[PDB]
Amino acid sequence: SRILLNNGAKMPILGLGTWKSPPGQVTEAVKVAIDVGYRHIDCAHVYQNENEVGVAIQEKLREQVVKREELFIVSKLWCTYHEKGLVKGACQKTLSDLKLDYLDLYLIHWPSGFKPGKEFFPLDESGNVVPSDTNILDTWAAMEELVDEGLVKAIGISNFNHLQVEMILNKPGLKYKPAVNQIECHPYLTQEKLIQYCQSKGIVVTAYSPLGSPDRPWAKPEDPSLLEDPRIKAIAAKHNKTTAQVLIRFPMQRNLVVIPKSVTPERIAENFKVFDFELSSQDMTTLLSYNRNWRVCALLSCTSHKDYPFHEEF
Ligand SMILES: NC(=O)c1ccc[n+]([C@@H]2O[C@H](COP(=O)([O-])OP(=O)(O)OC[C@H]3O[C@@H](n4cnc5c(N)ncnc54)[C@H](OP(=O)(O)O)[C@@H]3O)[C@@H](O)[C@H]2O)c1
Ligand SMILES: O=C(O)Cc1nn(Cc2nc3cc(C(F)(F)F)ccc3s2)c(=O)c2ccccc12
């Protein structure tokens, strides 16, 4: 149920995602999740719902359902706060919203810094994202300070390519190695090279968008649909499981952490019922065979940013 991180802490391999969970629904989602056994919640300031996630956690702590030490709460430093001077306040805002005194894991959400200011996606008049003059290593050093001050127990990265990870690993005077790299991963984007890289370096990989993010706001009707893939439905039927259950179990059997999102109580419970069956070797081979290098998350307006991660092969 949990994987050991480099700081000695254990991270639950199944967590609840919260991107696109409206504040109207995420409090109930998190309450239900905790009731049915989730102990890991994946959050971010940019998801605009951390206050409501926080309400749910506070309530369940107060109800004596769970103790804080049993929860594993992750959040992420948004791109507009990469300047060394902005990092601590960004973390403290997340902590205040979540009503917590520490995070279990805090990630650099994307390797790119954006122009500081109120807008999460500052654009120029021609639609290009406006970068900031920040660099990965200075942002990393700021993240390390959060560990040293007790705000966070572990730090990591998200959407970093292997060269960007290597930059941090090779930093003279590195204080903390990244514990986790959180990346998009599912049968249409199987990430074999980056997973082998990270796992060889002692970095745990978390798979995001494991169901293919059908609710992503830029979906096009001609896009591939993992949950509707008849090939994956057939593997699910053979196990008397749903397609979502197969898609969640798949990364678990690759020694990945996985964070499916739902706000629908029946699905939150369904998605956790993945510890009672095993995909066969042939199932795993078949699912890996569906790779198409297809990404849910890769914003066009960011493709000229100097730190855009997806020009590299991996
Ligand atoms: N680090 C990053 O850059 C990054 C990027 C993307 C995602 N993430 C994290 O990863 C999480 C998961 O990714 P995601 O939100 O993109 O998408 P996802 O988990 O792949 O898919 C969520 C979508 O699937 C639906 N769904 C959930 N369970 C289902 C089930 N059993 N049957 C049918 N449909 C089901 C949900 O609907 P309902 O909610 O309406 O039930 C929602 O529309 C995020 O929420 C976020 O926490 C991180
Ligand atoms: O962020 C999430 O969790 C999900 C996520 N993904 N995307 C796609 C992105 N593509 C990027 C590319 C870069 C780049 F590094 F390439 F510059 C930087 C930042 C991004 S956001 C979004 O546009 C988005 C908008 C609101 C809330 C969350 C998201």
Q: Which atom of ligand 2 is nearest the CA belonging to 129?
A: 17
Contact 42, 74 (CB under 8 A): yes
Separation CA 7–CA 233 (nearest Å): 39
- Measured CA to CA, the distance from residue 120 to residue 109 in angstroms comes to 12
Q: 75 CB less than 6 Å from ligand 1?
A: no
* Structural tokens at position 188: 């249409």
Contact call for residues 177 and 6 (beta carbons, < 8 A): yes
What does the alpha-carbon distance between residue 216 and residue 97 come to, in Å, rounded to a whole number?
24
Is 82 a pocket residue for ligand 2 (Cβ < 6 Å)? no
| Alpha-carbon gap, residue 263 to 228, rounded angstroms | 19
Residue 242 is given by DSSP the state -
8 A C-beta contact, residue 159 and residue 309: yes
125 Cβ partners below 8 Å, 6+ apart? none
- Which residues make Cβ contacts (< 8 Å) with residue 199, sequence separation at least 6? 205, 255
Name the experiment that determined this structure: X-ray
| Residues contacting residue 214 through CB under 8 Å, at least 6 positions apart | 225, 226, 227
Exposure string for 125-156, b = 16+ CB within 10 A, e = fewer: eeeebbbbebebeebbbbbbbbbeeebbbbbb
Q: Is 109 exposed, middle or buried (0-12, 13-18, 19+ CB in 10 A)?
A: buried
Of 18, 110, 132, 158, which is best to mutate to test ligand 2, by the most ligand atoms within 8 angstroms of its C-beta?
A: 110
Q: Could you give the angle at the alpha carbon of 51 between the alpha carbons of 45 and 57, nearest 5°? A: 110
Q: Whose CA is closest to 308, among 70, 144, 79, 1?
A: 79
Residues 6+ apart with CB under 8 A from 103: 73, 74, 75, 91, 94, 95, 151, 152, 153
Q: How far is the CA of 297 from the centre of ligand 2 (A)?
A: 6
Ligand 1 lined by 212 (C-beta under 6 Å):
yes
Distance CA 87, CA 59 (A): 28
Q: Rounded to 5 degrees, what are φ and ψ at 37? A: 125, -10
Which residues form the catalytic set? 47
227: helix, coil or strand?
helix
Q: 74: helix, coil or strand?
A: strand
User: CA 143, 146, 148, 153 torsion: positive or negative?
Assistant: negative
Separation between Cα atoms, residue 267 and residue 135, nearest integer Å: 40
CATH number (domain holding residue 110): 3.20.20.100
Cα of 36 vs centre of ligand 1, distance in Å, is 18
The letter for the amino acid at 11 is M
261: number of Cβ within 10 Å:
24
Q: Nearest CA to 21 among 6, 31, 9, 11?
A: 31
- Which protein residue has the closest C-alpha to ligand 2 atom 7? 297
Q: Give the range of the structural domain holding residue 179, as residue numbers without chain letter.
A: 1-314
Ligand nearest to the CA of 187: 1
Ligand closest to the CA atom of residue 40: 1
- Number of neighbouring beta carbons within 10 Å of residue 72: 23
Contact assessment for residue 291 and residue 189, using Cβ atoms and an 8 Å cutoff? yes
Q: Count helices and strands (H / E) in the chain.
A: 10, 10
Widest CA span in the chain: 54
Structure tokens at 163: 């060269």
How many angstroms separate the alpha carbon of residue 299 from the centre of ligand 2? 6
Q: How many domains does the chain have?
A: 1
Q: Are 189 and 293 in contact (CB under 8 A)?
A: yes
CA-CA distances (angstroms) from residue 245 to 43, 54, 240, 285? Answer: 22, 27, 10, 17
Cβ-based neighbours of 173, under 8 Å, separated by 6 or more = none
Dihedral of CA atoms 147, 150, 154, 155 in degrees, nearest 10, equals: -40
